[PDB]
Amino acid sequence: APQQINDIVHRTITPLIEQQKIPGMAVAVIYQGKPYYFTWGYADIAKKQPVTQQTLFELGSVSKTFTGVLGGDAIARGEIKLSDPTTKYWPELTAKQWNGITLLHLATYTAGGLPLQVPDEVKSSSDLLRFYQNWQPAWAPGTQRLYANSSIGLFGALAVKPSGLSFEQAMQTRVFQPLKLNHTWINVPPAEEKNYAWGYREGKAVHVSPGALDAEAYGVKSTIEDMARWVQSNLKPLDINEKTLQQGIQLAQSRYWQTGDMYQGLGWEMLDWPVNPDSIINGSDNKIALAARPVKAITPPTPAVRASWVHKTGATGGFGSYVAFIPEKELGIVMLANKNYPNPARVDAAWQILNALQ
Ligand SMILES: NCCN[C@H]1CC[C@H](CC2=N[C@H]3Cc4cccc(C(=O)O)c4O[B@@-]3(O)O2)CC1
Ligand SMILES: [Cl-]
Ligand SMILES: [Cl-]
Ligand SMILES: [Cl-]
Ligand code: NA
Ligand SMILES: [Zn+2]
Ligand SMILES: [Zn+2]
């Protein structure tokens, strides 16, 4: 890598790892469109297995960017429209509170207060129907954004129904395979388990536990190389030869709602570039990111703006991930760690690196 990249990465990430007690970390810096890889520490402490470019990390809610792009691809195929009612895809959802809730609302957390988590008691198809049939909205649809797995998770499950594929098969066939993300998994196969890092929480080695709609909301695992390729693909969608996927990437970066200086895409979140770094850093704290806030609709949605900071945080019990990129500058970063450490620390480090390189 160029010396300027090596320098800023050492001076930013090694102290972050020191400050936050991160056991293992992988970073890709995309500079002039090309990834440069860095690793530190251990994927498995007790085995003394190092983080490598093949180590799988849990992406947590960075998975929602895959779900958003898969939904965009379905839009580009004509399989769904965001204005469609939820009940078009799930007719058994006969409870009246669902009248007026569209796929757009599910995808963008604006259905009116669907909860952050699907309850752990939901273990069967009938349990899930019962949960949504009995959910009572706090607000009218299209007025308040409340970040929620039960919202975008249901969006992803319904968006694949016209294809006839399971969510996993749709994601594999329509996103992972065309982009050559050959080490990205919803379910890690037995022969790849040797590369699956442990997450660390309060000194204990942990992996994400199964839950309803986990694949759609938080269940993807990937390597630093595949995640760099994901960033490259979202930086430069015209490089993608599959037109529906090129367009799905673009649609996931369209601006559907605004709250303050933040815009909601499909999975991705965006701000105008140049960005006020304090807004992305502070806005990433869960006290804010998880709070309900009023949204203003953007109709028609703004087509993807290349002068944007586009990003997403992710967490599981044992992992913390962050992706950010700036299409206009051909500049991005992926930070994968096997500890869930505070979001503002992630965003600050990402800002420091990308700001030094623009
Ligand atoms: N399709 C809904 C028909 N109206 C019904 C109107 C009463 C409402 C009770 C309620 N629950 C909260 C969430 C909510 C949802 C939709 C509309 C509103 C509204 O105030 O208009 C709304 O406001 B709330 O404070 O009022 C139940 C629905
Ligand atoms: Cl130094
Ligand atoms: Cl998979
Ligand atoms: Cl977890
Ligand atoms: Na699952
Ligand atoms: Zn140093
Ligand atoms: Zn050190």
GROMACS .gro file of C-alpha atoms and ligand atoms in nm:
model
  392
    1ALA     CA    1   0.000   0.000   0.000
    2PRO     CA    2   0.096   0.366  -0.039
    3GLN     CA    3   0.287   0.496   0.262
    4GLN     CA    4   0.021   0.757   0.337
    5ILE     CA    5  -0.237   0.479   0.377
    6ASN     CA    6  -0.013   0.260   0.591
    7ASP     CA    7   0.069   0.560   0.811
    8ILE     CA    8  -0.287   0.680   0.874
    9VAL     CA    9  -0.414   0.326   0.925
   10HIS     CA   10  -0.148   0.246   1.185
   11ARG     CA   11  -0.196   0.575   1.369
   12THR     CA   12  -0.576   0.541   1.372
   13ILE     CA   13  -0.656   0.172   1.404
   14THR     CA   14  -0.378   0.044   1.630
   15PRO     CA   15  -0.473   0.298   1.900
   16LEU     CA   16  -0.842   0.217   1.850
   17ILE     CA   17  -0.762  -0.150   1.911
   18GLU     CA   18  -0.561  -0.048   2.218
   19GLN     CA   19  -0.835   0.184   2.347
   20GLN     CA   20  -1.124  -0.061   2.290
   21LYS     CA   21  -0.957  -0.397   2.373
   22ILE     CA   22  -1.047  -0.550   2.035
   23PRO     CA   23  -0.907  -0.905   2.005
   24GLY     CA   24  -0.903  -0.919   1.624
   25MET     CA   25  -0.970  -0.675   1.346
   26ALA     CA   26  -0.966  -0.655   0.968
   27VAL     CA   27  -0.973  -0.328   0.773
   28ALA     CA   28  -0.999  -0.259   0.402
   29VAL     CA   29  -0.926   0.091   0.279
   30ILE     CA   30  -1.054   0.150  -0.073
   31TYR     CA   31  -0.843   0.428  -0.224
   32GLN     CA   32  -0.888   0.531  -0.587
   33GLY     CA   33  -1.118   0.231  -0.614
   34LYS     CA   34  -0.859  -0.028  -0.498
   35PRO     CA   35  -0.867  -0.212  -0.165
   36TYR     CA   36  -0.572  -0.224   0.070
   37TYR     CA   37  -0.599  -0.478   0.349
   38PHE     CA   38  -0.486  -0.469   0.710
   39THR     CA   39  -0.531  -0.723   0.988
   40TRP     CA   40  -0.453  -0.737   1.358
   41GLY     CA   41  -0.482  -0.987   1.639
   42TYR     CA   42  -0.675  -1.307   1.677
   43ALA     CA   43  -0.984  -1.461   1.527
   44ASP     CA   44  -0.975  -1.723   1.805
   45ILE     CA   45  -0.781  -1.615   2.115
   46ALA     CA   46  -0.743  -1.952   2.285
   47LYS     CA   47  -0.636  -2.129   1.964
   48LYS     CA   48  -0.403  -1.838   1.878
   49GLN     CA   49  -0.549  -1.827   1.527
   50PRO     CA   50  -0.474  -1.491   1.360
   51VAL     CA   51  -0.717  -1.274   1.174
   52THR     CA   52  -0.645  -1.319   0.803
   53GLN     CA   53  -0.804  -1.195   0.481
   54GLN     CA   54  -1.011  -1.518   0.488
   55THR     CA   55  -1.147  -1.473   0.841
   56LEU     CA   56  -1.526  -1.460   0.856
   57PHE     CA   57  -1.678  -1.192   1.079
   58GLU     CA   58  -2.041  -1.145   1.176
   59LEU     CA   59  -2.164  -0.833   0.997
   60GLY     CA   60  -2.468  -0.779   1.218
   61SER     CA   61  -2.690  -0.509   1.073
   62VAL     CA   62  -2.449  -0.440   0.783
   63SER     CA   63  -2.651  -0.738   0.653
   64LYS     CA   64  -2.935  -0.489   0.601
   65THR     CA   65  -2.737  -0.338   0.312
   66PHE     CA   66  -2.752  -0.674   0.135
   67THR     CA   67  -3.126  -0.695   0.209
   68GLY     CA   68  -3.178  -0.345   0.075
   69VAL     CA   69  -2.989  -0.417  -0.247
   70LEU     CA   70  -3.173  -0.747  -0.294
   71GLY     CA   71  -3.497  -0.555  -0.255
   72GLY     CA   72  -3.376  -0.296  -0.505
   73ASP     CA   73  -3.293  -0.576  -0.747
   74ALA     CA   74  -3.649  -0.707  -0.706
   75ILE     CA   75  -3.782  -0.358  -0.783
   76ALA     CA   76  -3.565  -0.343  -1.096
   77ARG     CA   77  -3.703  -0.683  -1.200
   78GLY     CA   78  -4.060  -0.554  -1.162
   79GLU     CA   79  -4.130  -0.816  -0.897
   80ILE     CA   80  -4.230  -0.562  -0.630
   81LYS     CA   81  -4.309  -0.193  -0.600
   82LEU     CA   82  -4.237  -0.004  -0.280
   83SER     CA   83  -4.589   0.144  -0.289
   84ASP     CA   84  -4.741  -0.206  -0.273
   85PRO     CA   85  -4.934  -0.295   0.044
   86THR     CA   86  -4.775  -0.548   0.277
   87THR     CA   87  -5.094  -0.753   0.250
   88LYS     CA   88  -5.033  -0.808  -0.122
   89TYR     CA   89  -4.748  -1.043  -0.022
   90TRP     CA   90  -4.896  -1.174   0.305
   91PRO     CA   91  -5.275  -1.196   0.269
   92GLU     CA   92  -5.307  -1.372   0.607
   93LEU     CA   93  -5.206  -1.041   0.768
   94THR     CA   94  -5.572  -0.949   0.798
   95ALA     CA   95  -5.551  -0.727   1.105
   96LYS     CA   96  -5.670  -0.375   1.025
   97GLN     CA   97  -5.360  -0.191   1.147
   98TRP     CA   98  -5.185  -0.319   0.835
   99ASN     CA   99  -5.412  -0.122   0.603
  100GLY     CA  100  -5.187   0.149   0.461
  101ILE     CA  101  -4.850  -0.005   0.557
  102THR     CA  102  -4.648  -0.051   0.237
  103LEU     CA  103  -4.323  -0.224   0.149
  104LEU     CA  104  -4.160   0.121   0.154
  105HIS     CA  105  -4.257   0.161   0.519
  106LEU     CA  106  -4.117  -0.180   0.611
  107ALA     CA  107  -3.791  -0.122   0.423
  108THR     CA  108  -3.729   0.218   0.581
  109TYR     CA  109  -3.848   0.161   0.942
  110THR     CA  110  -4.150   0.392   0.897
  111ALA     CA  111  -4.442   0.151   0.948
  112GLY     CA  112  -4.527   0.317   1.283
  113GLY     CA  113  -4.319   0.156   1.556
  114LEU     CA  114  -4.244  -0.205   1.471
  115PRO     CA  115  -4.002  -0.313   1.745
  116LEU     CA  116  -3.625  -0.326   1.729
  117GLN     CA  117  -3.628  -0.704   1.786
  118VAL     CA  118  -3.863  -0.979   1.684
  119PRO     CA  119  -3.940  -1.140   2.023
  120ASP     CA  120  -3.723  -1.442   2.102
  121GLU     CA  121  -4.042  -1.644   2.166
  122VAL     CA  122  -4.119  -1.636   1.791
  123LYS     CA  123  -3.995  -1.977   1.676
  124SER     CA  124  -4.244  -2.093   1.410
  125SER     CA  125  -4.425  -1.956   1.107
  126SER     CA  126  -4.749  -1.935   1.306
  127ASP     CA  127  -4.571  -1.749   1.588
  128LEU     CA  128  -4.450  -1.487   1.340
  129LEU     CA  129  -4.797  -1.433   1.194
  130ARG     CA  130  -4.937  -1.403   1.546
  131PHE     CA  131  -4.671  -1.145   1.634
  132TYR     CA  132  -4.749  -0.919   1.339
  133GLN     CA  133  -5.126  -0.976   1.363
  134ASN     CA  134  -5.121  -0.855   1.722
  135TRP     CA  135  -4.869  -0.572   1.694
  136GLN     CA  136  -5.024  -0.235   1.774
  137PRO     CA  137  -4.864   0.069   1.605
  138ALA     CA  138  -4.754   0.366   1.810
  139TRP     CA  139  -4.778   0.605   1.513
  140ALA     CA  140  -4.941   0.640   1.174
  141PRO     CA  141  -4.736   0.499   0.886
  142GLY     CA  142  -4.490   0.724   0.711
  143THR     CA  143  -4.439   0.970   0.997
  144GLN     CA  144  -4.173   0.836   1.236
  145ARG     CA  145  -3.858   0.635   1.177
  146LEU     CA  146  -3.784   0.369   1.442
  147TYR     CA  147  -3.489   0.150   1.344
  148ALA     CA  148  -3.608  -0.209   1.363
  149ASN     CA  149  -3.515  -0.562   1.264
  150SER     CA  150  -3.885  -0.658   1.260
  151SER     CA  151  -3.945  -0.394   0.990
  152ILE     CA  152  -3.668  -0.443   0.735
  153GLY     CA  153  -3.659  -0.812   0.821
  154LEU     CA  154  -4.018  -0.854   0.705
  155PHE     CA  155  -3.945  -0.640   0.398
  156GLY     CA  156  -3.671  -0.880   0.292
  157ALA     CA  157  -3.890  -1.187   0.351
  158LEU     CA  158  -4.176  -1.045   0.145
  159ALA     CA  159  -3.961  -0.893  -0.131
  160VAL     CA  160  -3.842  -1.241  -0.239
  161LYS     CA  161  -4.189  -1.396  -0.256
  162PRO     CA  162  -4.250  -1.322  -0.628
  163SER     CA  163  -3.924  -1.496  -0.719
  164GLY     CA  164  -4.038  -1.820  -0.561
  165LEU     CA  165  -3.697  -1.846  -0.394
  166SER     CA  166  -3.618  -1.856  -0.026
  167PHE     CA  167  -3.452  -1.540   0.104
  168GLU     CA  168  -3.120  -1.726   0.129
  169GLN     CA  169  -3.144  -1.866  -0.224
  170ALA     CA  170  -3.241  -1.527  -0.364
  171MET     CA  171  -2.950  -1.359  -0.189
  172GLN     CA  172  -2.705  -1.624  -0.309
  173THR     CA  173  -2.831  -1.634  -0.667
  174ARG     CA  174  -2.901  -1.263  -0.720
  175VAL     CA  175  -2.637  -1.084  -0.509
  176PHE     CA  176  -2.354  -1.298  -0.372
  177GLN     CA  177  -2.286  -1.506  -0.685
  178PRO     CA  178  -2.294  -1.226  -0.948
  179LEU     CA  179  -2.059  -1.017  -0.734
  180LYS     CA  180  -1.826  -1.313  -0.673
  181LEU     CA  181  -1.875  -1.290  -0.297
  182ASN     CA  182  -1.774  -1.653  -0.262
  183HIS     CA  183  -1.689  -1.626   0.110
  184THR     CA  184  -2.007  -1.450   0.222
  185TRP     CA  185  -2.272  -1.659   0.394
  186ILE     CA  186  -2.604  -1.649   0.568
  187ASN     CA  187  -2.529  -2.002   0.695
  188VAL     CA  188  -2.159  -2.082   0.718
  189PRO     CA  189  -2.102  -2.426   0.565
  190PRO     CA  190  -1.919  -2.691   0.771
  191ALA     CA  191  -1.607  -2.669   0.555
  192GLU     CA  192  -1.578  -2.292   0.612
  193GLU     CA  193  -1.627  -2.308   0.991
  194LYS     CA  194  -1.248  -2.310   1.038
  195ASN     CA  195  -1.241  -1.948   0.915
  196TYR     CA  196  -1.527  -1.827   1.136
  197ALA     CA  197  -1.385  -1.594   1.401
  198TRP     CA  198  -1.517  -1.599   1.754
  199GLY     CA  199  -1.679  -1.288   1.888
  200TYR     CA  200  -1.585  -1.173   2.236
  201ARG     CA  201  -1.825  -1.032   2.494
  202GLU     CA  202  -1.720  -0.989   2.857
  203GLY     CA  203  -1.430  -1.224   2.788
  204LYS     CA  204  -1.649  -1.505   2.654
  205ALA     CA  205  -1.635  -1.642   2.298
  206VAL     CA  206  -1.976  -1.605   2.134
  207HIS     CA  207  -2.153  -1.639   1.801
  208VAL     CA  208  -2.485  -1.490   1.698
  209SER     CA  209  -2.784  -1.699   1.801
  210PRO     CA  210  -3.060  -1.793   1.558
  211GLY     CA  211  -3.375  -1.586   1.550
  212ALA     CA  212  -3.674  -1.511   1.332
  213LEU     CA  213  -3.579  -1.305   1.025
  214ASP     CA  214  -3.212  -1.314   1.126
  215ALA     CA  215  -3.091  -1.371   0.768
  216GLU     CA  216  -3.268  -1.054   0.656
  217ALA     CA  217  -3.174  -0.832   0.949
  218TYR     CA  218  -2.840  -0.930   1.098
  219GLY     CA  219  -2.717  -1.276   0.998
  220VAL     CA  220  -2.459  -1.241   0.719
  221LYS     CA  221  -2.095  -1.341   0.778
  222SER     CA  222  -1.818  -1.230   0.543
  223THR     CA  223  -1.445  -1.176   0.497
  224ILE     CA  224  -1.260  -0.849   0.460
  225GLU     CA  225  -1.193  -0.928   0.093
  226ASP     CA  226  -1.558  -0.993   0.012
  227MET     CA  227  -1.663  -0.682   0.204
  228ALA     CA  228  -1.414  -0.470   0.013
  229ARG     CA  229  -1.571  -0.605  -0.307
  230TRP     CA  230  -1.915  -0.516  -0.168
  231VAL     CA  231  -1.793  -0.160  -0.113
  232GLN     CA  232  -1.642  -0.148  -0.462
  233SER     CA  233  -1.975  -0.264  -0.607
  234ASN     CA  234  -2.169   0.002  -0.417
  235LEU     CA  235  -1.910   0.269  -0.508
  236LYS     CA  236  -1.927   0.184  -0.879
  237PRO     CA  237  -2.256   0.019  -0.967
  238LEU     CA  238  -2.198   0.070  -1.341
  239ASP     CA  239  -1.917  -0.185  -1.310
  240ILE     CA  240  -2.185  -0.449  -1.239
  241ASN     CA  241  -2.286  -0.619  -1.564
  242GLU     CA  242  -2.616  -0.758  -1.429
  243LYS     CA  243  -2.850  -0.467  -1.495
  244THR     CA  244  -3.107  -0.546  -1.225
  245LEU     CA  245  -2.832  -0.562  -0.964
  246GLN     CA  246  -2.664  -0.247  -1.091
  247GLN     CA  247  -3.002  -0.075  -1.059
  248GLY     CA  248  -3.077  -0.240  -0.723
  249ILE     CA  249  -2.755  -0.098  -0.583
  250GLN     CA  250  -2.853   0.245  -0.713
  251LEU     CA  251  -3.205   0.217  -0.570
  252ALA     CA  252  -3.072   0.121  -0.227
  253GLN     CA  253  -2.879   0.450  -0.225
  254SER     CA  254  -3.180   0.658  -0.328
  255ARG     CA  255  -3.303   0.897  -0.059
  256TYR     CA  256  -3.654   0.805   0.062
  257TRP     CA  257  -3.680   0.998   0.390
  258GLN     CA  258  -3.486   1.275   0.564
  259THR     CA  259  -3.433   1.332   0.935
  260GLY     CA  260  -3.195   1.617   1.013
  261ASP     CA  261  -2.892   1.571   0.790
  262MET     CA  262  -2.951   1.196   0.749
  263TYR     CA  263  -3.125   1.026   0.458
  264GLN     CA  264  -3.270   0.675   0.467
  265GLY     CA  265  -3.196   0.440   0.178
  266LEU     CA  266  -3.275   0.069   0.152
  267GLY     CA  267  -3.044  -0.058   0.425
  268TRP     CA  268  -2.785   0.207   0.350
  269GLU     CA  269  -2.801   0.544   0.522
  270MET     CA  270  -2.660   0.855   0.355
  271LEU     CA  271  -2.551   1.214   0.423
  272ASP     CA  272  -2.442   1.483   0.179
  273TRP     CA  273  -2.065   1.504   0.133
  274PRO     CA  274  -1.877   1.696   0.263
  275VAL     CA  275  -2.024   1.579   0.593
  276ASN     CA  276  -2.002   1.730   0.940
  277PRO     CA  277  -1.805   1.454   1.113
  278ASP     CA  278  -1.973   1.518   1.447
  279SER     CA  279  -2.310   1.441   1.292
  280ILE     CA  280  -2.207   1.095   1.170
  281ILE     CA  281  -2.007   1.017   1.485
  282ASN     CA  282  -2.267   1.134   1.735
  283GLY     CA  283  -2.559   1.009   1.527
  284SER     CA  284  -2.415   0.659   1.541
  285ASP     CA  285  -2.454   0.632   1.920
  286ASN     CA  286  -2.732   0.385   1.993
  287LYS     CA  287  -2.909   0.634   2.220
  288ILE     CA  288  -2.980   0.829   1.898
  289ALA     CA  289  -2.969   0.566   1.626
  290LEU     CA  290  -3.235   0.361   1.804
  291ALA     CA  291  -3.464   0.653   1.894
  292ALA     CA  292  -3.784   0.740   1.715
  293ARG     CA  293  -3.761   1.057   1.511
  294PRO     CA  294  -3.993   1.227   1.264
  295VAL     CA  295  -3.920   1.188   0.896
  296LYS     CA  296  -3.999   1.401   0.593
  297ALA     CA  297  -4.087   1.206   0.281
  298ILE     CA  298  -3.885   1.258  -0.036
  299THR     CA  299  -4.121   1.198  -0.330
  300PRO     CA  300  -3.994   1.100  -0.578
  301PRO     CA  301  -3.696   0.955  -0.392
  302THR     CA  302  -3.376   1.135  -0.479
  303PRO     CA  303  -3.172   0.915  -0.715
  304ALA     CA  304  -2.839   0.809  -0.565
  305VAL     CA  305  -2.618   1.114  -0.511
  306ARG     CA  306  -2.250   1.047  -0.576
  307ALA     CA  307  -2.146   1.328  -0.336
  308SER     CA  308  -2.266   1.132  -0.033
  309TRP     CA  309  -2.121   0.965   0.270
  310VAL     CA  310  -2.295   0.627   0.256
  311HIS     CA  311  -2.262   0.401   0.557
  312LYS     CA  312  -2.395   0.138   0.794
  313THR     CA  313  -2.302   0.011   1.141
  314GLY     CA  314  -2.351  -0.346   1.254
  315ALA     CA  315  -2.345  -0.532   1.582
  316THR     CA  316  -2.396  -0.877   1.721
  317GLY     CA  317  -2.319  -0.982   2.077
  318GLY     CA  318  -1.956  -1.042   1.991
  319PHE     CA  319  -1.887  -0.837   1.677
  320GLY     CA  320  -1.880  -0.478   1.561
  321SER     CA  321  -1.870  -0.378   1.194
  322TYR     CA  322  -1.873  -0.054   0.999
  323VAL     CA  323  -1.877   0.030   0.629
  324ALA     CA  324  -1.859   0.378   0.479
  325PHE     CA  325  -1.790   0.506   0.131
  326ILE     CA  326  -1.799   0.821  -0.080
  327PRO     CA  327  -1.881   0.744  -0.446
  328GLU     CA  328  -1.760   1.079  -0.582
  329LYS     CA  329  -1.415   1.026  -0.425
  330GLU     CA  330  -1.381   0.651  -0.500
  331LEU     CA  331  -1.301   0.612  -0.133
  332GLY     CA  332  -1.430   0.370   0.128
  333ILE     CA  333  -1.353   0.168   0.436
  334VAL     CA  334  -1.462  -0.159   0.594
  335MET     CA  335  -1.383  -0.221   0.963
  336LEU     CA  336  -1.462  -0.572   1.096
  337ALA     CA  337  -1.393  -0.650   1.462
  338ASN     CA  338  -1.472  -0.944   1.689
  339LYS     CA  339  -1.584  -0.720   1.972
  340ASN     CA  340  -1.898  -0.504   1.978
  341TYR     CA  341  -1.738  -0.172   2.072
  342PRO     CA  342  -1.913   0.168   2.063
  343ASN     CA  343  -2.027   0.294   1.725
  344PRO     CA  344  -1.891   0.650   1.767
  345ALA     CA  345  -1.539   0.510   1.804
  346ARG     CA  346  -1.581   0.324   1.474
  347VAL     CA  347  -1.712   0.622   1.283
  348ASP     CA  348  -1.449   0.858   1.424
  349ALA     CA  349  -1.170   0.625   1.310
  350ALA     CA  350  -1.327   0.583   0.966
  351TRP     CA  351  -1.362   0.960   0.928
  352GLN     CA  352  -1.002   1.022   1.031
  353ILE     CA  353  -0.877   0.776   0.769
  354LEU     CA  354  -1.098   0.884   0.480
  355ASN     CA  355  -1.054   1.255   0.555
  356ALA     CA  356  -0.676   1.209   0.548
  357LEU     CA  357  -0.701   1.043   0.206
  358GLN     CA  358  -0.941   1.266   0.013
  359LIG     N1  359  -5.576   0.273   0.962
  359LIG     C1  360  -5.591   0.336   1.095
  359LIG     C2  361  -5.736   0.382   1.123
  359LIG     N2  362  -5.754   0.466   1.243
  359LIG     C3  363  -5.743   0.401   1.375
  359LIG     C4  364  -5.752   0.536   1.449
  359LIG     C5  365  -5.730   0.521   1.599
  359LIG     C6  366  -5.598   0.454   1.627
  359LIG     C7  367  -5.559   0.453   1.773
  359LIG     C8  368  -5.420   0.504   1.765
  359LIG     N3  369  -5.315   0.434   1.771
  359LIG     C9  370  -5.200   0.521   1.750
  359LIG    C10  371  -5.125   0.483   1.619
  359LIG    C11  372  -5.201   0.530   1.497
  359LIG    C12  373  -5.208   0.454   1.381
  359LIG    C13  374  -5.278   0.499   1.270
  359LIG    C14  375  -5.343   0.621   1.274
  359LIG    C15  376  -5.340   0.700   1.390
  359LIG    C16  377  -5.419   0.827   1.391
  359LIG     O1  378  -5.415   0.893   1.504
  359LIG     O2  379  -5.484   0.864   1.294
  359LIG    C17  380  -5.267   0.653   1.499
  359LIG     O3  381  -5.260   0.731   1.610
  359LIG     B1  382  -5.265   0.662   1.735
  359LIG     O4  383  -5.235   0.765   1.838
  359LIG     O5  384  -5.415   0.634   1.748
  359LIG    C18  385  -5.600   0.315   1.565
  359LIG    C19  386  -5.619   0.324   1.414
  360CL      CL  387   0.252   0.597   1.585
  361CL      CL  388  -2.564  -1.874   0.265
  362CL      CL  389  -2.595  -1.194   1.912
  363NA      NA  390  -3.233  -1.791   0.987
  364ZN      ZN  391   0.226   0.392   1.660
  365ZN      ZN  392  -0.050  -0.157   2.010
   0.00000   0.00000   0.00000
